[PDB]
Design a protein around this motif. Structure first.
Motif, PDB file in Angstrom:
ATOM      1  N   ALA A  49       0.859  -1.174   0.000  1.00  0.00           N
ATOM      2  CA  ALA A  49       0.000   0.000   0.000  1.00  0.00           C
ATOM      3  C   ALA A  49       0.893   1.220   0.000  1.00  0.00           C
ATOM      4  N   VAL A  50       0.562   2.225  -0.808  1.00  0.00           N
ATOM      5  CA  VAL A  50       1.306   3.481  -0.849  1.00  0.00           C
ATOM      6  C   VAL A  50       0.387   4.565  -0.304  1.00  0.00           C
ATOM      7  N   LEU A  51       0.849   5.304   0.706  1.00  0.00           N
ATOM      8  CA  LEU A  51      -0.016   6.143   1.522  1.00  0.00           C
ATOM      9  C   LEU A  51       0.542   7.559   1.612  1.00  0.00           C
ATOM     10  N   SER A  52      -0.261   8.542   1.199  1.00  0.00           N
ATOM     11  CA  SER A  52      -0.102   9.945   1.599  1.00  0.00           C
ATOM     12  C   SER A  52      -1.289  10.273   2.482  1.00  0.00           C
ATOM     13  N   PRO A  53      -1.111  10.467   3.786  1.00  0.00           N
ATOM     14  CA  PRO A  53      -2.262  10.456   4.700  1.00  0.00           C
ATOM     15  C   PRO A  53      -2.971  11.800   4.811  1.00  0.00           C
ATOM     16  N   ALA A  54      -4.265  11.722   5.092  1.00  0.00           N
ATOM     17  CA  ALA A  54      -5.084  12.917   5.283  1.00  0.00           C
ATOM     18  C   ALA A  54      -4.928  13.535   6.669  1.00  0.00           C
ATOM     19  N   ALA A  55      -4.189  12.890   7.550  1.00  0.00           N
ATOM     20  CA  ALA A  55      -3.830  13.436   8.849  1.00  0.00           C
ATOM     21  C   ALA A  55      -2.560  12.732   9.274  1.00  0.00           C
ATOM     22  N   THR A  58       3.483  -1.136   3.929  1.00  0.00           N
ATOM     23  CA  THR A  58       2.978   0.188   3.593  1.00  0.00           C
ATOM     24  C   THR A  58       4.158   1.114   3.345  1.00  0.00           C
ATOM     25  N   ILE A  59       4.097   1.835   2.236  1.00  0.00           N
ATOM     26  CA  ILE A  59       5.126   2.786   1.838  1.00  0.00           C
ATOM     27  C   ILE A  59       4.569   4.186   2.029  1.00  0.00           C
ATOM     28  N   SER A  60       5.331   5.032   2.710  1.00  0.00           N
ATOM     29  CA  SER A  60       4.960   6.436   2.901  1.00  0.00           C
ATOM     30  C   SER A  60       5.379   7.242   1.683  1.00  0.00           C
ATOM     31  N   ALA A  61       4.452   8.041   1.121  1.00  0.00           N
ATOM     32  CA  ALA A  61       4.744   8.846  -0.064  1.00  0.00           C
ATOM     33  C   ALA A  61       4.562  10.329   0.215  1.00  0.00           C
ATOM     34  N   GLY A  62       5.605  11.125  -0.082  1.00  0.00           N
ATOM     35  CA  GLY A  62       5.502  12.579  -0.149  1.00  0.00           C
ATOM     36  C   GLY A  62       5.503  13.347   1.160  1.00  0.00           C
ATOM     37  N   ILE A  63       4.766  12.865   2.155  1.00  0.00           N
ATOM     38  CA  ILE A  63       4.628  13.565   3.435  1.00  0.00           C
ATOM     39  C   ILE A  63       4.697  12.558   4.574  1.00  0.00           C
ATOM     40  N   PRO A  64       5.128  13.010   5.766  1.00  0.00           N
ATOM     41  CA  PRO A  64       5.294  12.083   6.896  1.00  0.00           C
ATOM     42  C   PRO A  64       3.964  11.517   7.395  1.00  0.00           C
ATOM     43  N   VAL A  65       4.008  10.282   7.902  1.00  0.00           N
ATOM     44  CA  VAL A  65       2.878   9.728   8.638  1.00  0.00           C
ATOM     45  C   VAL A  65       3.385   9.202   9.983  1.00  0.00           C
ATOM     46  N   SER A 109       3.541   6.656  12.031  1.00  0.00           N
ATOM     47  CA  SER A 109       3.493   5.217  12.289  1.00  0.00           C
ATOM     48  C   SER A 109       4.881   4.639  12.096  1.00  0.00           C
ATOM     49  N   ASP A 110       5.431   4.013  13.145  1.00  0.00           N
ATOM     50  CA  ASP A 110       6.743   3.383  12.988  1.00  0.00           C
ATOM     51  C   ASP A 110       6.668   1.990  12.388  1.00  0.00           C
ATOM     52  N   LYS A 111       5.483   1.581  11.918  1.00  0.00           N
ATOM     53  CA  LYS A 111       5.304   0.300  11.236  1.00  0.00           C
ATOM     54  C   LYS A 111       5.328   0.429   9.708  1.00  0.00           C
ATOM     55  N   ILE A 112       5.445   1.653   9.187  1.00  0.00           N
ATOM     56  CA  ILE A 112       5.726   1.888   7.774  1.00  0.00           C
ATOM     57  C   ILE A 112       7.013   1.185   7.390  1.00  0.00           C
ATOM     58  N   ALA A 113       7.013   0.549   6.210  1.00  0.00           N
ATOM     59  CA  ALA A 113       8.210  -0.172   5.761  1.00  0.00           C
ATOM     60  C   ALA A 113       9.321   0.794   5.369  1.00  0.00           C
ATOM     61  N   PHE A 114       8.999   1.769   4.507  1.00  0.00           N
ATOM     62  CA  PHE A 114       9.920   2.852   4.175  1.00  0.00           C
ATOM     63  C   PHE A 114       9.107   3.961   3.532  1.00  0.00           C
ATOM     64  N   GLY A 115       9.759   5.103   3.343  1.00  0.00           N
ATOM     65  CA  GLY A 115       9.120   6.238   2.719  1.00  0.00           C
ATOM     66  C   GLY A 115      10.003   6.875   1.662  1.00  0.00           C
ATOM     67  N   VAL A 116       9.358   7.638   0.783  1.00  0.00           N
ATOM     68  CA  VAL A 116      10.056   8.479  -0.181  1.00  0.00           C
ATOM     69  C   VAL A 116       9.382   9.825  -0.089  1.00  0.00           C
ATOM     70  N   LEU A 117      10.125  10.842   0.345  1.00  0.00           N
ATOM     71  CA  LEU A 117       9.486  12.152   0.527  1.00  0.00           C
ATOM     72  C   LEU A 117      10.557  13.226   0.414  1.00  0.00           C
ATOM     73  N   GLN A 118      10.397  14.324   1.151  1.00  0.00           N
ATOM     74  CA  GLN A 118      11.421  15.356   1.264  1.00  0.00           C
ATOM     75  C   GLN A 118      11.461  15.831   2.702  1.00  0.00           C
ATOM     76  N   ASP A 119      12.493  16.613   3.019  1.00  0.00           N
ATOM     77  CA  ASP A 119      12.709  17.119   4.372  1.00  0.00           C
ATOM     78  C   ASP A 119      11.898  18.403   4.532  1.00  0.00           C
TER      79      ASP A 119
END
Length: 318
Positions: free
Chosen positions: A78-84, A102-109, A111-121
């Motif tokens: 699952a790829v997730l950009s969260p609404a909160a 679950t992959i975090s996309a674009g913005i932080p979420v 949850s420390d159970k996310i596998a990895f993310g791709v976003l910016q600082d």
């Protein structure tokens, strides 16, 4: 190079299905991420089963239901950009118990159970806009802050980075009221109110496209020659930069983030060496790649490659 030399493109050999949910597809950022995922997948033997939208910031239940439906569709990620920011750890944990990472996309979420993310600082996005402000000669001058919504984490991070750098060069910022949903209408109404209340302001800071557009509409209506700082390009920003109304726009390269999500997912899925991942941070509690930050201004609006890495193709929709 569509991947900017970050990683070599490869092709999935094992079947790999993605489900994607983002907040909304109304600007170039999440829509860019979605385009980058879809277009990279068709280069890479990856199936995108569904792209869904929360519909608005705060539409958390809508996204929980979407993530649950990915379970039934047999997605692998699952790829997730969260609404909160908060509240997704139970559903991420539930997907993981079903073998779905679950992959975090674009913005932080949160949850420390996310596998990895791709976003910016997000803090550094604020810092580079702070530098643009300071280099314009903002020392001693008043800056209206329209910080975005509360409960999302990343608008606060952008505000914090901007304030640190802007304060250090002697700019005088208004306090920041975190409210609204970062719409065009919010940018207009909030900036119209703050221009009236801050008659000596010469700048307006905003964290996202539509708040910047709304700020410009307010400045135009009030005949106030304020310069606006914002983030995430749209085509119409180009003329606004040249005409001097936007001082600087941080590039948010959603398209490359989407491509990278696909290339990282294939490697994770097939047990291959991962491309670069930063360590978890306080706000981003999982391994994650941060795309380097560039700012668009008069000096590079005609040369910066934001149209290749930040705009989905004209006429693309999903």
């Amino acid at each position: 190079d569509r991947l900017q030399g970050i990683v070599e493109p490869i092709v999935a050999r094992q079947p790999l299905k993605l489900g994607v949910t983002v907040v909304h597809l109304l600007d170039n950022f999440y829509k860019g991420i979605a385009y980058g995922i879809v277009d990279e997948a068709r280069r890479s033997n990856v199936e995108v089963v569904q792209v869904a939208v929360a519909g608005a910031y705060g539409n958390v239940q809508q996204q929980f239901a979407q993530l649950q439906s990915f379970k039934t569709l047999g997605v692998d990620y699952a790829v997730l950009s969260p609404a909160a920011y908060s509240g997704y750890d139970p559903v991420v944990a539930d997907l993981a118990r079903s073998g779905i990472k679950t992959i975090s996309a674009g913005i932080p979420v949160n949850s420390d159970k996310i596998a990895f993310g791709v976003l910016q600082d997000d803090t550094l996005i604020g810092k580079v806009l702070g530098k643009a402000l300071c280099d314009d000669g903002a020392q001693g001058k008043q800056v209206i802050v329209v910080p975005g919504a509360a409960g999302l984490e990343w608008p606060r991070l952008r505000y914090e980075g901007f304030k640190e750098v802007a304060s250090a060069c002697g700019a005088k910022l208004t306090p920041a009221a975190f409210r609204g949903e970062m719409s065009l209408a919010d940018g207009m109404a909030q900036t119209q109110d703050l221009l009236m209340r801050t008659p000596d302001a010469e700048y307006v800071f905003t964290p996202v496209t539509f708040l910047g557009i709304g700020a410009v509409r307010a400045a135009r209506q009030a005949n106030r020659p304020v310069k606006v700082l914002t983030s995430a390009m749209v085509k119409e920003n180009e003329a606004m930069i040249r005409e001097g109304r936007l001082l600087a726009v941080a590039s948010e390269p959603g398209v490359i983030m989407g491509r990278l999500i696909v290339q990282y997912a294939i490697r994770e899925h097939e047990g291959l060496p991962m491309p670069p991942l930063d360590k978890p941070t306080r706000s981003v509690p999982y391994p994650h790649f941060n795309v380097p930050i560039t700012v668009v201004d008069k000096s590079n609006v005609d040369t910066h490659p934001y149209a290749f890495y930040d705009y989905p193709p004209q006429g693309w929709s999903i």
